[PDB]
Design a protein around this motif. Structure first.
Motif, PDB file in Angstrom:
ATOM      1  N   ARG A  34       0.832  -1.208   0.000  1.00 45.23           N
ATOM      2  CA  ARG A  34       0.000   0.000   0.000  1.00 45.23           C
ATOM      3  C   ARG A  34       0.867   1.260   0.000  1.00 45.23           C
ATOM      4  N   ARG A  35       1.996   1.187   0.704  1.00 47.58           N
ATOM      5  CA  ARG A  35       3.013   2.231   0.624  1.00 47.58           C
ATOM      6  C   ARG A  35       3.513   2.388  -0.814  1.00 47.58           C
ATOM      7  N   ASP A  82       2.755  -5.254   7.710  1.00 46.63           N
ATOM      8  CA  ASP A  82       2.535  -4.377   6.562  1.00 46.63           C
ATOM      9  C   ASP A  82       1.683  -5.062   5.476  1.00 46.63           C
ATOM     10  N   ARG A  83       0.569  -5.646   5.908  1.00 50.94           N
ATOM     11  CA  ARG A  83      -0.328  -6.424   5.048  1.00 50.94           C
ATOM     12  C   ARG A  83      -0.889  -5.630   3.860  1.00 50.94           C
ATOM     13  N   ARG A  86      -6.138  -3.796   4.788  1.00 52.57           N
ATOM     14  CA  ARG A  86      -6.592  -3.660   6.156  1.00 52.57           C
ATOM     15  C   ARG A  86      -7.845  -4.504   6.445  1.00 52.57           C
ATOM     16  N   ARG A 206      10.588  -3.468   9.465  1.00 53.10           N
ATOM     17  CA  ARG A 206      10.843  -4.030  10.784  1.00 53.10           C
ATOM     18  C   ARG A 206      11.298  -5.473  10.675  1.00 53.10           C
TER      19      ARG A 206
ATOM     20  N   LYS B 253      -0.592   5.750  12.885  1.00 53.09           N
ATOM     21  CA  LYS B 253      -0.105   5.337  11.580  1.00 53.09           C
ATOM     22  C   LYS B 253      -0.197   6.490  10.587  1.00 53.09           C
ATOM     23  N   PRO B 254       0.763   6.560   9.660  1.00 53.19           N
ATOM     24  CA  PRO B 254       0.779   7.660   8.697  1.00 53.19           C
ATOM     25  C   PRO B 254      -0.397   7.548   7.714  1.00 53.19           C
ATOM     26  N   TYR B 256      -1.003   8.452   3.958  1.00 54.53           N
ATOM     27  CA  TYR B 256      -0.403   8.863   2.679  1.00 54.53           C
ATOM     28  C   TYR B 256      -1.269   9.805   1.869  1.00 54.53           C
TER      29      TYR B 256
HETATM   30  O1  LIG Z   1       2.170   2.344   8.051  1.00 52.84           O
HETATM   31  C1  LIG Z   1       1.425   1.878   7.153  1.00 52.84           C
HETATM   32  O2  LIG Z   1       1.699   2.034   5.949  1.00 52.84           O
HETATM   33  C2  LIG Z   1       0.195   1.129   7.493  1.00 52.84           C
HETATM   34  C3  LIG Z   1      -1.049   1.740   7.388  1.00 52.84           C
HETATM   35  C4  LIG Z   1      -1.183   3.173   6.960  1.00 52.84           C
HETATM   36  O3  LIG Z   1      -1.894   3.505   5.977  1.00 52.84           O
HETATM   37  O4  LIG Z   1      -0.593   4.070   7.611  1.00 52.84           O
HETATM   38  C5  LIG Z   1      -2.178   1.009   7.721  1.00 52.84           C
HETATM   39  C6  LIG Z   1      -3.538   1.624   7.611  1.00 52.84           C
HETATM   40  O5  LIG Z   1      -4.353   1.135   6.782  1.00 52.84           O
HETATM   41  O6  LIG Z   1      -3.871   2.614   8.314  1.00 52.84           O
HETATM   42  C7  LIG Z   1      -2.053  -0.315   8.120  1.00 52.84           C
HETATM   43  C8  LIG Z   1      -3.269  -1.093   8.466  1.00 52.84           C
HETATM   44  O7  LIG Z   1      -3.639  -2.053   7.733  1.00 52.84           O
HETATM   45  O8  LIG Z   1      -3.906  -0.768   9.502  1.00 52.84           O
HETATM   46  C9  LIG Z   1      -0.813  -0.926   8.218  1.00 52.84           C
HETATM   47  C10 LIG Z   1      -0.734  -2.355   8.666  1.00 52.84           C
HETATM   48  O9  LIG Z   1      -0.175  -3.231   7.971  1.00 52.84           O
HETATM   49  O10 LIG Z   1      -1.261  -2.697   9.749  1.00 52.84           O
HETATM   50  C11 LIG Z   1       0.319  -0.188   7.903  1.00 52.84           C
HETATM   51  C12 LIG Z   1       1.672  -0.808   7.983  1.00 52.84           C
HETATM   52  O11 LIG Z   1       2.368  -0.964   6.941  1.00 52.84           O
HETATM   53  O12 LIG Z   1       2.111  -1.180   9.090  1.00 52.84           O
END
Ligand SMILES: O=C(O)c1c(C(=O)O)c(C(=O)O)c(C(=O)O)c(C(=O)O)c1C(=O)O
Ligand SMILES: O=C(O)c1c(C(=O)O)c(C(=O)O)c(C(=O)O)c(C(=O)O)c1C(=O)O
Ligand SMILES: O=C(O)c1c(C(=O)O)c(C(=O)O)c(C(=O)O)c(C(=O)O)c1C(=O)O
Lengths: 293, 291
Positions: A34-35, A82-83, A86, A206, B253-254, B256
């Motif tokens: 997603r990043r 980092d699934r 969500r 991580r 959490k960030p 984007y």
């Molecule tokens: O840090 C992330 O990229 C992240 C995010 C994010 O958008 O900031 C989320 C999110 O949807 O808010 C999630 C999530 O699924 O809640 C995760 C995650 O894997 O739990 C991450 C992440 O990469 O850790």
């Protein structure tokens, strides 16, 4: 055999080397996508599931073309780092693509990949129409690809915590055989076929590994990319393979009783100050963790 | 709260923080101690097993005093990296010391440590007499430290490949109970007591983890020191703890979709600039991780 040489080799001889020396089984979750998607695509126009699925194909293709026999790829669970999704509805769109999209079906064919699924998904997938359909598609994909013998691809769906599964399996096996199942039979029961212990796990971000029950060993080489998985290039992959194949198991072992004062001083300085360095300690920028280097 | 603040804390504070925020369960094998011994001691004059033992006591004391409840320490098996002994006669010397040495019995006593052993050591070990004796010592030690309630120490001896053990445990359990054992029951079965999943693992050298079956998770934070385990200072431990407690699970959490073009650019550039932690190099037959 030097790194530069290994990077300069044509793909075929690398695949030969890997078929001889491994890694035979490799674990590779696609993390941070997603990043990756918010950096490398246009979320306003591009379809997330299709972009991701195209990259999964690219990376699976790459791994198999380098001579890796089995890939284990955690896809969805409670402890995936980092699934890709969500919420489980989106994850189910992804899984369905894995089992139904023409492009990836063509990939399985062209590379003779037999595709298996592991984990508690038959119970734990949503007791919904959509999850029922997904389970169905999984069973069908395992069947339709069952003539493929060159590669094995195992997708993990709720593929953590195999303990209860092993217990119930063992109870059943004992009831049906009069003796406990061997380790081999336990593995076949969990993954659908016998799979050797993982030779490497490639993670992201991580330092953490997950979702490959029964397959982990101290011999499993661990890597953690700085960039999310879909940034993986062929060069990166080769640096990792070179490290596992030639560096992690270098011979002969050093004989420290054979070392000069200088030799011990030199080695002492590396380990001694400076200072108390540990890989896996990181820093946070804008809510995002990065390993310190 | 910052790294520097955390490091400046009184130990008691650090420990209360650990007690309530974790790591509650920490895996810490003592690896490369033969490199350490050849580098820091005199093999012509120093006794190896005793030196190692003394360092083990130091680090264990350090962990328990920092508020950690359960430490799991692989001692001997077939997939350990940089193990303390190449041959089992020596490894049996070390094990024997863990169950019989005055200094360490005193350590278990003063820090109220309950000590358990896990793995397939009862089958493998007592092929010989020395092994049989070590096994009895293991049992005696579990019993004689059993009233200690502050901390738990699990030593791993052939503590990889639990599958077959879990299988037999489950068959037996189902035969005596009429139902499969739960996860908790399985864990109690293998470790002697219920143990929560590992919150962290601290290795050395080549990135690899091992010998804590049933207790590993995506949430287990992993660390690999550059120097052999016995070089560990209190500062290293505190950096590790700080990372696990405040960094590995940073909130919020960030988002984007809420970043400016410039913010997206800076992050895109960290990732587009190609590094892999775990990739290394070799000097004089020894592997080091590249920074
Ligand atoms: O840090 C992330 O990229 C992240 C995010 C994010 O958008 O900031 C989320 C999110 O949807 O808010 C999630 C999530 O699924 O809640 C995760 C995650 O894997 O739990 C991450 C992440 O990469 O850790
Ligand atoms: O299995 C090995 O890789 C190995 C080797 C080897 O290179 O094949 C050697 C060797 O170089 O001779 C040795 C050795 O020290 O003699 C060992 C060994 O330490 O027992 C191994 C091995 O670890 O299996
Ligand atoms: O064979 C050994 O026991 C050994 C090992 C080993 O744990 O397998 C190592 C090692 O840390 O991997 C080393 C080493 O320090 O690299 C040595 C060695 O003395 O070089 C040995 C050994 O006893 O030879």
């Amino acid at each position: 055999v030097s790194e530069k040489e290994f990077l300069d080799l044509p793909l075929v001889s690398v695949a030969e080397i890997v078929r001889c020396r491994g890694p035979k089984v490799s674990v590779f979750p696609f993390d941070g996508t997603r990043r990756w998607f918010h950096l490398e695509c246009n979320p306003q126009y591009d379809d997330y599931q299709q972009a991701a699925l195209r990259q999964s194909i690219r990376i699976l293709k790459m791994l198999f073309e380098h001579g890796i026999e089995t890939v284990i790829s955690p896809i969805f669970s409670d402890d995936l780092l980092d699934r890709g999704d969500r919420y489980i509805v989106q994850a189910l769109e992804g899984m369905a693509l894995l089992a139904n999209d023409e492009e990836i079906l063509s990939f399985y064919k062209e590379h003779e990949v037999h595709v298996l699924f592991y984990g508690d998904y038959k119970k734990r997938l949503p007791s919904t129409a959509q999850g029922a359909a997904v389970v169905k598609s999984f069973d069908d994909l395992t069947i339709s690809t069952s003539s493929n013998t060159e590669h094995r691809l195992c997708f993990g769906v709720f593929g953590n915590d195999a303990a209860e599964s092993v217990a119930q399996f063992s109870i059943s096996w004992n009831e049906t055989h009069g003796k406990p199942p061997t380790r081999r039979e336990i593995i076949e029961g969990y993954y659908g076929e016998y799979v050797d212990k993982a030779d490497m796990f490639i993670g992201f971000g991580r330092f953490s590994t997950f979702d490959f029950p029964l397959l982990s060993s101290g011999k499993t080489s661990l890597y953690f990319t700085v960039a999310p998985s879909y940034y993986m290039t062929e060069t990166t992959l080769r640096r990792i393979l070179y490290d596992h194949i030639y560096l992690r198991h270098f011979r002969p072992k050093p004989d420290y009783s054979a070392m000069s004062a200088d030799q011990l001083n030199v080695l002492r300085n590396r380990y001694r100050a400076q200072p108390d360095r540990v890989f896996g300690v990181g820093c946070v920028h804008d809510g995002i963790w990065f390993a310190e280097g």
